[PDB]
Design a protein around this ligand. Sequence first.
Ligand SMILES: Nc1ncnc2c1ncn2[C@@H]1O[C@H](COP(=O)(O)OP(=O)(O)OP(=O)(O)O)[C@@H](O)[C@H]1O
Length: 510
Amino acid sequence: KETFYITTPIYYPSGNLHIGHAYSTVAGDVIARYKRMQGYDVRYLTGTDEHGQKIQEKAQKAGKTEIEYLDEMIAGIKQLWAKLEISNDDFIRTTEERHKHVVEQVFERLLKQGDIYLGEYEGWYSVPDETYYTESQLVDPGGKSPDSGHEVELVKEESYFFNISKYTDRLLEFYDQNPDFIQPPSRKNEMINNFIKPGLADLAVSRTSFNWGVHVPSNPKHVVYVWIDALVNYISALGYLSDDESLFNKYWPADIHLMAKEIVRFHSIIWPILLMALDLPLPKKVFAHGWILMKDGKMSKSKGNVVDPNILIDRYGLDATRYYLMRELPFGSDGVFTPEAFVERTNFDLANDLGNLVNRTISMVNKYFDGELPAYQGPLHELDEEMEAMALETVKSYTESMESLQFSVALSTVWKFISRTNKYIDETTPWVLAKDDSQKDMLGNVMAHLVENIRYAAVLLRPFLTHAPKEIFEQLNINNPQFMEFSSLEQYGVLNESIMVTGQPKPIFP
Ligand SMILES: Nc1ncnc2c1ncn2[C@@H]1O[C@H](COP(=O)(O)OP(=O)(O)OP(=O)(O)O)[C@@H](O)[C@H]1O
């Protein structure tokens, strides 16, 4: 079987994870499940970026040691992914020796090759802006930020520097060979002012001002700078430079690195250059989504302008939480959270459109045939040929949207099919057919189309929702695992033996 490897970013446990982090991890989970259903050998990784001054500060901020603070935070994150039913195959932590050893190895290798050299970084850090500046960029100079008005802090410390400019021609050559590397196309607007043409400055890849992180074996006063440390997670979790590299050679290069837009530059410039320096294959694709916003900007874990996903899961359930994120907030833009939109998505799309349809269909199969669904014969009603064609086009359109990670467009397309199946009841009028004994076949045909239409939706929603499709298969009494796969949607009319549906149809209530 063909392999597929997808990653989220390793999240910085500086606070509790909000719904933006949930979107990222659910989005990657949707693809993982989707790819497993297509017949790929999938590995899906997530994790925690546990080193840095920022973690060292947040442990200070919560008046506590480094490793005690983290253990408590990592427990909460694993509990969240458990509650979200994320099908991640592994959880990488940068504090683990399996990661650390590889970072140490990589860093000493770059040292041996001459790629890195000892020096001093001198610059101007704006405390509010969280961005470094040169002295010429300062306003009223020891000066003000050009972006804001806050005066800057002078930062001088020993640092290793990585000669990245020599990989410029190979990087530009890689972009030419892989013009669709960054998806969606709007996200390579993050590559504006990239400095590749005029010349990339040597990157400061270690700190001496703090001591929390991966220490450089040659010079332990230095700690490896957080971004090269963090990016190693994608290859270290597969056992790169360990005594078993079987996962690395099976899954690398990664098919998708998933993220939000603000780390496209890091994943598109620094990460391929690092891989080039190790003579490793480059990632296939970078998929970057937008931000969930509030009323004071992007949802931020250090700021606290957040919605806790535990609140949404506890109150409304898992399916409503997962559906809302994927449907309401498109991959290719930013989006505002509101409690209004959440209940509308929950009640109108899930409980009504899908939930009514299932209840209506089972109620009529119980009423007219005593639960005994007649087998699919063919498109016997005059509308069936178009509707069966629509079902096939729904799967094809769904596929196109899913391959480009347009999750809201895929779900929107699925919901047009669900709505049309509700309208199919209205315009066929089974209750009227049921009065005439001579129309029993047509009535059977109509019920058969309703059940098959529902099965199409349920299969397509398996990557998105973990409970409701399973609940739908149980009530309709589709036990065969074959009828739950994508391949069974390739031709309409799967159920050609009669089926007994449930006698006590409960609400699906997704
Ligand atoms: N508002 C958001 N919308 C979507 N994704 C988000 C959001 N915030 C964080 N993420 C996800 O987390 C990744 C960034 O992880 P990070 O660890 O920095 O959390 P943070 O909230 O961005 O940081 P900070 O702690 O500085 O606010 C993004 O690339 C994205 O995957």
